[PDB]
Amino acid sequence: GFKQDIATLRGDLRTYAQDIFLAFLNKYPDEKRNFKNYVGKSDQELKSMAKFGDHTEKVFNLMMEVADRATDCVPLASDASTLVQMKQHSGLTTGNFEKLFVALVEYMRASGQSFDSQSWDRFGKNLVSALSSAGMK
Numbered sequence: 514g515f516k517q518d519i520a521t522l523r524g525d526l527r528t529y530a531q532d533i534f535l536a537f538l539n540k541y542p543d544e545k546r547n548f549k550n551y552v553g554k555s556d557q558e559l560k561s562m563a564k565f566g567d568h569t570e571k572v573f574n575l576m577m578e579v580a581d582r583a584t585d586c587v588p589l590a591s592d593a594s595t596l597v598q599m600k601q602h603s604g605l606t607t608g609n610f611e612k613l614f615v616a617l618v619e620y621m622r623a624s625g626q627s628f629d630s631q632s633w634d635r636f637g638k639n640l641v642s643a644l645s646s647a648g649m650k
């Protein structure tokens with residue numbers, strides 16, 4: 514289930530983090546508008562841009578902590594506050610986060626692996642709700 518999925522992703526977190534974030538950017542090309550430097554790049558090129566590899570690994574390092582600190586796929590309000598408050602996310606709305614989790618769930622659904630994709634779907638919705646409550650637009 515969800516807690517085992519955290520251990521699976523953490524066991525190869527660099528590859529999962531890149532493959533899910535690329536799934537997100539290819540499913541929602543307009544989302545590259547928050548990045549700029551990513552435009553007109555193939556997946557293999559993106560993987561070779563330092564701010565892609567670094568920022569994608571740090572997204573997934575923190576997302577796995579937030580998942581790990583969750584009860585029944587409900588994140589801590591403190592984790593939502595922390596995320597909202599991040600100066601680098603000034604641009605963002607809950608819409609950016611919803612789309613990332615739609616792509617994550619779709620990626621898990623298409624994998625050959627026994628991920629608990631319905632738990633991730635609820636995690637993504639609960640995190641979007643928590644971010645809104647914590648002040649994200």
Ligand code: HEM
Pocket residue numbers: 544547548564567568571572573575576601602605609610613
């Ligand atoms: C659980 C989800 C996410 C987490 C944990 C997260 C985490 C982070 C972290 C830790 C940083 C700082 C890392 C660093 O720059 O060294 C960062 C920067 C940034 N995040 Fe996020 N982020 C998340 C989702 C998103 C989403 C959905 C977007 C846009 C759709 C986004 C856009 C950005 C941007 C634009 C930056 C800085 C600009 C750059 O990449 O050069 N983040 N994020």
